[PDB]
Amino acid sequence: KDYECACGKYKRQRFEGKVCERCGVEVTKSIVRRYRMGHIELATPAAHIWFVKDVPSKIGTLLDLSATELEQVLYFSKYIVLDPKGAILNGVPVEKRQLLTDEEYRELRYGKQETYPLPPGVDALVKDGEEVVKGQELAPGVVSRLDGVALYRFPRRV
Amino acid sequence: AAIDPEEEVIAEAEGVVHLHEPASILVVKARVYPFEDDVEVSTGDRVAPGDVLADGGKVKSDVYGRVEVDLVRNVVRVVESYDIDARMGAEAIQQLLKELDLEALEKELLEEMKHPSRARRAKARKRLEVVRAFLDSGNRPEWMILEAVPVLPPDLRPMVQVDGGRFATSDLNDLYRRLINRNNRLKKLLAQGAPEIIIRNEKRMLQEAVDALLDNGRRGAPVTNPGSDRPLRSLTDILSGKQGRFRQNLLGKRVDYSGRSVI
Amino acid sequence: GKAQFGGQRFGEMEVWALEAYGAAHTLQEMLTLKSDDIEGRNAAYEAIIKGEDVPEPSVPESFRVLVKELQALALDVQTLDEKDNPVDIFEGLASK
Amino acid sequence: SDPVRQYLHEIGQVPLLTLEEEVELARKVEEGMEAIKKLSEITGLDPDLIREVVRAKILGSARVRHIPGLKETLDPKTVEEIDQKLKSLPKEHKRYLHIAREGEAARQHLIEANLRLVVSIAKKYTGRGLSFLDLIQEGNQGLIRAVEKFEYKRRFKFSTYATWWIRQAINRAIADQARTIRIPVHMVETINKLSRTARQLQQELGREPTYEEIAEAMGPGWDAKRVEETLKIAQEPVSLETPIGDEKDSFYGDFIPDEHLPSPVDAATQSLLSEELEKALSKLSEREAMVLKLRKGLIDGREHTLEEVGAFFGVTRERIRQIENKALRKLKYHESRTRKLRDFLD
């Protein structure tokens, strides 16, 4: 309402510019509700769709990223590498602005491992802590797919 | 150890222990570094070859990896893996956009302008036109990514009581609400340390909420009010088309002092 | 529409007619005092009931709507004078 | 290309837990919280601050941000200081750090392993005003709650405890977010009750029930007036962009007058009135014109009592009543003479 704060402490134009302490509302023309903007502070930055999806994409064009690549990074289908930190994948070093899948990112970032179920009652051939080559037999029916340290999960019998 | 004092296994006398019939065997590609005294790195820490692990500096790591401190096996595992920086979403892109030296890219692209192949010169031009746009204008490319999202003044998206005391409201209010809800939930999930799968889902949903707000239907299925097939009317829809702001309220208007009748 | 006591639509093609006649002041009236120029239409009515000539128009409110809608899209639209300095068409109401 | 399908694929990349694995993680989490409690005692550091620092190192450098309840800004400077103070503990104390660390790690894994549970619960609550993915995230929020409260000792499977927390979380979301005009959860509860009841009444009566019939069916406290007021409150707004019949060439908002901004006539009329009112008040003494302005609210917007006007001009409540009537009488005289203000009475 014109020159009237929310709670009504200051109700006329003698106060113009006052900000009511109780209710917090400015005394001015109500017309400003057509003019004054608010804003939302995002937790994560978000891309403006015009500069993504308007072809040829402006963001894609500056960064030399195709339509498909830019979609995949923006919509969380693929990682893009900012700093390889000496990473290497499949024998070749990971270079910046390279796209990694989830499996590729997890293997790089958290390492590669595998867990092998043991047929009920069957006891292991190798012992806990023992280094194992790929292809080596863990149990009568269990063969390891990768090199590394074998670890016992839940011993049923001590 | 067990739930109740009984059923516990307490050692009857002096002896040595052997483990049998494990449920599964976990093969990890990792290095094991046993330690007699105290360990200086705690579990989860990231480590490069040469970093000190336990026993005041005696034992150190041979590989790049992630620290697993085993208090049972009394060994410090290092799981082979790197401190690699790889990101998803608009945050990654905002970073790559900040890290653009447009001056350099103009130079690089001009050198590309001397190449004989027609396609080489053509693409370098289109890129160079975008580069030059930003250069001449003074706009920073990272502005194509939003951090603060503007909110249109309320009287332009009104909530008004119609004649019958009923309420009528603009579709933008619902589009903002989806945004606000998803942003707030994202803040909460961050403070509560949700797993990356959950935080990632929230982030991609946040992008879609911004997308529907700015241009609904542009990417992916259009956002609708419940139990209606009508796409909500977004900012882009308001501006453009026959019914848009330009061709409806700007290049033509309804006017006062006017009338009509049969001739 | 008649049921709302409406005004007639003076649409794009009608504006073309006023343009082809070169009737610039007639056209400006359609775009401001007889439509969405709030300050203008109020002042124009007051002048007619007082016998004065109608005043020169002000900014159409629908342009202000356009400006704010482009701000909601994170686009900065600035009305500038010949010196390329900003002109405030909101008359201080929208600036802190 | 489909956000739901995508999420379904990512959850399917975390294998479900074995009975053993479930207990191990749940166990490590409980033990880990206990470790953080002790680290509080030993160090004298807020349990939450310790928990956030432990959690920071587990999740990695990726997530570092300010946490609300915490008094200190949480940044690598403070997390190194606090982590370095924790690593400054003697071996028997420093063991609790390793436990807390493994607790956070196990919690992450426990949560991730139950995400498919949330999906199967969320799919049943669709169509109530939240999108499928919105329901999943709120359900996930509950799943996070369940992991913190779970007591593994009771030997119940996790799915049993979580389901309560997940259902609770989704239902709060629907009650909290589904309406453009937000309604308190309890009020939302009443409305749904009123709906269910009427649906029963219509199924037995073979026709729509009256307000009175619903008020009886609702029990004590309810009459028809309250049934009606409740339904009025339950009305959702309608879109200004709803298309009107014919071609899609007209929206509903276009038929709604603006009742707020004065019309050209009104602007003219009110302005002319303000000007004639002042012409008559300057023809009063300053002292007797100011009293009338204070009493009718033309100054400050409030109509002041007789006692208050006495305090500002420092006179008696009866004196102020007297100058108002003589002021108003003199005003009345100038009016009968100039006929200026008569036409504004409509």
Added chain:
RNA sequence: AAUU
């Protein structure tokens, strides 16, 4: 859906 009408009128021109």
Added chain:
DNA sequence: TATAATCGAGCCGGGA
């Protein structure tokens, strides 16, 4: 707050 529950359901022109 504790049985257990664990992956959805119109024709047309122009430009990358």
Added chain:
DNA sequence: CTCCCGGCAAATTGT
């Protein structure tokens, strides 16, 4: 080529 997005007369009325 194929696909993906942008266009596709005006004013008026009526339930």
